[PDB]
Symmetry: C4
Subunit: 379 residues, 4 copies
C-alpha cells in the first residue's frame, strides 16, 4: 500500500517503537509500505527482552528490603507497585504481540481509504493529517519529558541512598514499557481520528449537495449515490480499525483504571506523611494528570467520530426534506436514509464496551469507589 | 436577533448576573439583541474577581483555627467545606467563561426559532413564555431568600463569637457564586422548556391534521410537509442548545451529586451531636431540599421534552394509519415517519449522559453509596 | 363506561379498599361505572385517618423505651423499623391520593379497549379475565393471612409482656397501610395483564392471517389494516396505564428495595442472637418471601407484555416475507412494519426506569450492596 | 427428528449425563431422535438422589467439628463452603428438572434447522459441527481431570487425618453435581454455536449474491427472497434456544459470580496463612481459572453470534448499494433491509440480561466489589 504525509511519520515512530513492523520506500509525497518478517522478529525479540527485564526488575525490587526500596516501604506499597508495573507489562505485551495482525489490517483498509480519498477530495486533504500529527506528536514529547523526569527523580532518591545502579537496572525496563504503551495509545488516537477527519470531509461534500439541489461535477441524482457508497466504505474501515485495535484498546483502559486507583493511593499516603517530599508529591500529581490525559486521548477520537455520525444523520434528513417527491433523488436518499439506520459508525473494543464518552462517567464511577475501598484497607 | 416577551426578562436577569453579556434595545413587545464586548469584559472581570475572593476566603478559613471556624471544627469538616465551596467555584467559572459562546449559540438558533414561530402560531404564543417565566422567577426568589437566611445565620454564629467581619469577608464571595450557578441552572431550565412548549404547539398543530384529513389553511398534502420541515428545525435547535449548555450542564450535575454527599454528611454529624443547634439543623435540611430541587429543575425540562417526542411519535402513527393508501399524503407521512426515527430529539450534555429522568435514579444510586462510604471514614 | 366480568370484582375490591372510588350499577354480565365524589371524599378521609394513626403509632413506639418495645430493642432497631413503616405510609399516601385521576384514566382508556374488543374476539374473551382474577385474588388472600399471622405473633409478644393494648394501637394502622399498598400493587398486576391477554388475542388474530394469505371475514388486504389500527389503540392504552400508575408504581419499587434491605437486617441480627425466637425467625423469612413475590408481581406482567411485543414483531416479519410483492397487502404490511418500529409497547413508570425484568437484576444489584454496607455499621 | 454428526455425540453425552433424556436409533450418518419417558424418569431419579446426597453431605460437614473439617476450619469457612455447594445444587436441579421441556424445544427447532440446511449447504456442512465437537469435548475432559484431581487432593487431606471414608461420602455427590452443571453449560455452548456456524454459512451464501449481481442456481431476484425466508427461520430458532435455555443459563451465571466471590476468598485467606499448602494453593488457582473459563464458554458463542449479525447488516447494505434502482431486486432487498431491523438475532436468558460480552464487564464490576466487601467482614 501507500501512506501519504504524516501518517508515514507516526508509523515511522511506531516502527522504531516496534509497534509497527513496516518496511517502506519513499515517494515524492508518500511511502510505499510492506511488512518485514525481519522487523516482526526484531519487535518480538525487543518486547520479549524488555518484558523479561521488567519482570526481573519487579522480582529484584520485591527481593530487596522495604528499608532500601525508596517507593516500596511496606508490603502494601509492594502490592500497589506490582499493580503499577504488571498491567503495563500486560498492555505492552498484548499490544506488540498482535502488531503484525494490526498492520495486516492497516494494509487492508488503507487501500480502500485511498480509493475513497480519490473521490472525497484527497487533493490537499493531507493537510488535515499534517495538523493532527503536529498536534499528537507534542503529546508523546510531553510524556517522554515526564517519564525522564520521573526516572531522574528516582535516580536521585537512589543516589542519596547510595543504590543508583540497582534502582536503575530494576526500572529501566518498566519505563520503556510505559513509553511503548504510550506509543500504542497515540497510534490509535491518530488512526481513529484521521478516519474522523475523512468522515468530516465526506459530510461537507454531502452538505453542499443540499445547496446543489436547492439551487460537484454530477447532479445529486448521481452524487448522492456515489457518496452513499463511500458512506459504506467509511463504515467498513471503522469496523476494521475497531477490531484490529479492540484487544489492546480495552486492556489499556483497564490498566488506566488500575493506575487511577494506584496513583491516588500513593498521593494520599504520601500526604498523610509529612509533605516534605515535594518533588515526589508534584511528580505523582503530574502522573495523575497523565493517567487522565491518556484516557481522554483514548476516548476523544471516538466521541468526535460519533458526532460526525450524528451530524450526518442530521444533514441527510435536511436534504431528504428538501428533495422533490418521487424523483430519482428521493429513492437514492431513501437508500441513504436506511443506510444510516443499519451501518451506524461506532468504535467498540472487542464489543466489550461502548467507547463513547459515557465510558469516562462509568470508569470514574468505578475509580471513586475502588480508590476509597482500597484505602480503607490501609487503615 | 429579536427576543419577545419574558425571554427578554430572564436574559436581562442573566445579563445583570453576568451570565449573558447581551446589549438590547426595546420594541413594543420585543427587544433587539446584540453581544457587547464591554459586557463580556465586565463579566470576565466580575467572575474572576469573585472567584479570587472565594478562593481567598477558603484559604482564610483553612488558615483560621478549628476553634473559631464555626462550621469547620475539624480537618474532616474543612475537607467537606472545601468540597462544598470549590466545585461551586468550578461550576461558576466554567459556566460564565463560556458565556459569549453560549450567547453566540442563542443568537444563532433564535432566528430559526422565530422563523418556525412565524408558522407555528407565534401569535399570542408568548403567553406560554410569560407563564413559564412567572413560574421560574419564583424559584430564583426562593433561593435568594434561602441564601440570605443562610448568610444571616452564619453571621449570627460570627456575632455570638465576636468574629463577624472576618466570617463575612470569608464567605460573601462564595454565596454570590452560589447565586450565579443558580442563575445559570434556571436559564437552562427556561430555554430548554420554552423549546418544549414550542414542540407542544407543533404537536397539536399536527394532531389537528388528523381531524382535517378525517373530515389550517392548506390541505394535509402540504401541511404535513411544511410541518415536517419545522420538525427538522425544532431538532437542530435542540442540538444547538444541548451543545451550548453541555459543559456547565454536566459540571453542575457533578457539583450537585457532590453537594448531596456533603450536606447530608453535615446533617448527620450535626445530629450525632446534640440537636440544640436547631437553626443550623433546619437550615441544612432546607439546603438538602434545595440541592434536590435544583437537580429536579435540571432534569424535568428534558423529561417533559422527550414526552413531547414520544407523543409526536404516537400521533404521527395515528395519522399514518388513517391516511389513504398511495396518495401523496402517504408519501409525505412516510417522510415524516422516517424523520422521527432519524432525528430523535433529546438533550445530552457533552453526550456524557442521557439527561432524561433515569439520570436521577443513577445519581441517587451513587449518592446513597458514597454518603455512607464517606461517613464510614468519620467513625 | 362498562366493566365486564372479574375486572368488576377486582375494582370492587379496590373500591372497598378505597383505592378505586367507583360507583357502579349491575348488568347481566357487566357493570356500568362512574366516579362518586362521595366515595372520593370517603377514601381521602379513610387514608388520611390511617396515615395519621400510623404516624401516631410510630411516634408512640419511638416514645416507649427499648426495654418494652418488643422489636425495637435499640436505636438502630428503631431506625430500621421507622424505615419499615414510613415508606409504606408514603406508598399508601401517594397511591390513594392519586386514585381519582387513576380512575379518570381508566374511564378513558376502557372505552377504547371495549371498542377494540368489539373486533378482537370480545365474545367469551372475558374467560381470560376470569382466570386471571381467580389466580390474582389468591395472592391477596395469602398476604392477608400472612399479615394477620404477623399481627397475632406480635400480639403474643405483647401479651407475654403485658402490653397488649398499647402494641395493638401502635400497629393496627401500619398493618392496614400494608394491606392497602398490596391492593394497589395487585390492581396494577391485573390491569397491565388483562391488557397483555388482549395483546395475545390480537397477536393470534394476526397470526391466522398468515395462514389465510398462505391458503376472519375479510381478506388480509383489509384485515391487516384494521388490525394495524387496533395495534395503535393497544399501544395508546398501554401508555395511558403506564402513566396513570407510574408514580405509585415507582414508589412501591423503592419501598420494596428498602424492605429487602430492612427485613434481612432483622433476620441476620435475630440469628446472630440465639435462634430460640423460632416464630419470629419463620415470620421474618415469610416476610422476605413476600417482599420478593410482590416485586415479581410488579415486574412479571411487564415482561409477559414485552414478550407479546417481540412475538408480534416476529409474526409480522413472517407474514411480510410470504406476502406477494407489490400487491396492496405488501403496502399495508409495510405500514405495520413501520408501526412496530415507532409504537413500541413498553411500560415505564414515570419513564424513570425500564420496568422489564432487567429491573430485578438492577434492584438485587443494589440490595446485595446496601444490605451489607448497612450491616457493617451495626458492627 | 434426525441428528447428524457430532451433535449426536454431544447429545449422547448429555443423555448419559441425564441432561438429555433422548432415545435414538442409528443411521449411516445420523440418528433418529425421540424422548423416552423412562429416560426422563431415570434422570429425575438420578439428580434427585444426587441432590439429596449432596445436601446430606453438606449437613454432615456442618455437623462435623471445624477441627476435623479440612476446608471448614471456621464458621466463615462453613458459610462460604455452603455457598460453594448450594448454588451448584441449585443450578444442577433447575437445569435437569427442565430437561424434558428443553428437549421438546430441540425436537421442535431442529426440524426447521434441517429444512434450512436443505437449502444452506447442508452437504458437508456437518464438518463444522465435527470441528466444534472436537474442540468442545476437550473442555469437558479438562474439567473432568481437574475435578478428579481436586477430589484426590481432598482425599489425601482426609487420609493424612484418618477420615477418608467420611470426607469421601460427604463430597462424592457435590463433585458429580459440578460435572452435571459443566455438561449443561457445554451443551449450551454447542447448540448456540452450531447455530452461529449456520448463520455464517447463510451470510457467505448471501455475500456471493453480491458478486452474482455485480457480474447459486437462481438469479438474485429470487435468491435474496429465499435467503430472507431462511433469515427469518434462523431468528425464530435462536429465540427458541434462548428461551429453552434461559433459566439455567442465568442461574449458572449467578452461580459463577458467586464462585468468583467464594474461590478468591479461599485463595486470599489461604495465602494470608503460610503458603505451605502448595497443592491447595495451586488447585484453588486452577479452580479460579475454571470459574473464569466456564463464564467465557457461556458468553463467547453469543458474542460470536452477534458478530455474524452485525456482518450480515454490513453485507446487506453493500448489496443494497450496488443493486439497480427500482428493479425487483431492489424491493426484495428493501424487505431484507427491514427484516434486519425487526428480527435482530440475539440471545437473552429469560430476557434478564443481554448475554453479549458486556455481561463480563458487568459481572467483573460486581465481583471486584463483592469480593472486597466480603473479605472486609473477615477482618
Ligand atoms: C468531569 C466530571 C464527570 C462526572 C459527570 C457526572 C457523573 C454522572 C453520574 O451520576 O454517574 C455516576 C458516576 O460516579 C461518580 O460520581 C464518579 C465521578 C466523579 C464525581 C464524584 C467524585 C468527586 C470528583 C472530584 C455514577 O454512575 P455509574 O454507577 O453508572 O458509574
Ligand atoms: C424518588 C425515588 C427514586 C428511586 C426509584 C427506584 C430506584 C430503582 C433502582 O433499583 O436503582 C437503584 C438506585 O439506587 C438507589 O436505591 C438509591 C435511590 C434511593 C433509594 C435507596 C435509599 C433510600 C432513600 C430514602 C440502583 O440502580 P443503579 O446502580 O443503576 O444506580
Ligand atoms: C435470580 C438471580 C438473578 C441474578 C442474575 C445474575 C445477575 C447478573 C449480574 O451480573 O448483575 C449484577 C447484579 O448484582 C448481583 O449479583 C445481585 C444479585 C444476587 C446475586 C449475588 C448475591 C447472592 C444471592 C444469594 C450486577 O449488575 P448491576 O451493577 O448493573 O446491578
Ligand atoms: C479483561 C478485563 C476486562 C475489563 C475491561 C475494562 C472495564 C471497563 C469499566 O470501566 O467497567 C467497570 C468494571 O469494573 C471493574 O473494573 C472490574 C473489572 C476488573 C478491573 C478492576 C480490578 C483489577 C483486575 C485485576 C465498572 O463498570 P460497571 O459498574 O458498569 O460494572
Amino acid at each position: 500500500c501507500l501512506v501519504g504525509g504524516a501518517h508515514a511519520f507516526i508509523l515511522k515512530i511506531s516502527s522504531f517503537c516496534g509497534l509497527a513492523p513496516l518496511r517502506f520506500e519513499p515517494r515524492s509525497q508518500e511511502y510505499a509500505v510492506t511488512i518485514s518478517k525481519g522487523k516482526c522478529f526484531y519487535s518480538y525479540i525487543l518486547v520479549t527482552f524488555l518484558v523479561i527485564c521488567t519482570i526481573y526488575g519487579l522480582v529484584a525490587e520485591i527481593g530487596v528490603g522495604v528499608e532500601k526500596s525508596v517507593r516500596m516501604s511496606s508490603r502494601m506499597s509492594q502490592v500497589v507497585s506490582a499493580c503499577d508495573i504488571l498491567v503495563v507489562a500486560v498492555t505492552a505485551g498484548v499490544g506488540v504481540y498482535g502488531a503484525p495482525a494490526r498492520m495486516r489490517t492497516m494494509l487492508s483498509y488503507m487501500e480502500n481509504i485511498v480509493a475513497v480519498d480519490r473521490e472525497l477530495g484527497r487533493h490537499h486533504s493531507a493537510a488535515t493529517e499534517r495538523k493532527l500529527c503536529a498536534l499528537l506528536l507534542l503529546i508523546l514529547l510531553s510524556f517522554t519529558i515526564l517519564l525522564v523526569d520521573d526516572f531522574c527523580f528516582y535516580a536521585m532518591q537512589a543516589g542519596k541512598t547510595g543504590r543508583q545502579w540497582e534502582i536503575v537496572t530494576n526500572y529501566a525496563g518498566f519505563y520503556f514499557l510505559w513509553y511503548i504503551v504510550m506509543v500504542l495509545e497515540l497510534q490509535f488516537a491518530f488512526t481513529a481520528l484521521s478516519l474522523r477527519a475523512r468522515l468530516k470531509l465526506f459530510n461537507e461534500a454531502l452538505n453542499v449537495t443540499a445547496s446543489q439541489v436547492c439551487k460537484l461535477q454530477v447532479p445529486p441524482c448521481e452524487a448522492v449515490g456515489r457518496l452513499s457508497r463511500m458512506r459504506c466504505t467509511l463504515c467498513e474501515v471503522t469496523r476494521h480499525i475497531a477490531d484490529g485495535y479492540g484487544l489492546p484498546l480495552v486492556i489499556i483502559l483497564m490498566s488506566t483504571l488500575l493506575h487511577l486507583i494506584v496513583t491516588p493511593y500513593f498521593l494520599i499516603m504520601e500526604i498523610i506523611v509529612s509533605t516534605h517530599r515535594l518533588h515526589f508529591l508534584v511528580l505523582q500529581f503530574l502522573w495523575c494528570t497523565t493517567h487522565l490525559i491518556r484516557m481522554l486521548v483514548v476516548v476523544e477520537p471516538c466521541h468526535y467520530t460519533m458526532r460526525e455520525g450524528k451530524r450526518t444523520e442530521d444533514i441527510v434528513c435536511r436534504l431528504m426534506t428538501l428533495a422533490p417527491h418521487g424523483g430519482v433523488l428521493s429513492s437514492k436518499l431513501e437508500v441513504l436514509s436506511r443506510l444510516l439506520m443499519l451501518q451506524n459508525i461506532s468504535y467498540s473494543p472487542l464489543g466489550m464496551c461502548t467507547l463513547d464518552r459515557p465510558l469516562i462517567v462509568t470508569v470514574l464511577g468505578a475509580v471513586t469507589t475502588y480508590l476509597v475501598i482500597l484505602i480503607q484497607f490501609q487503615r
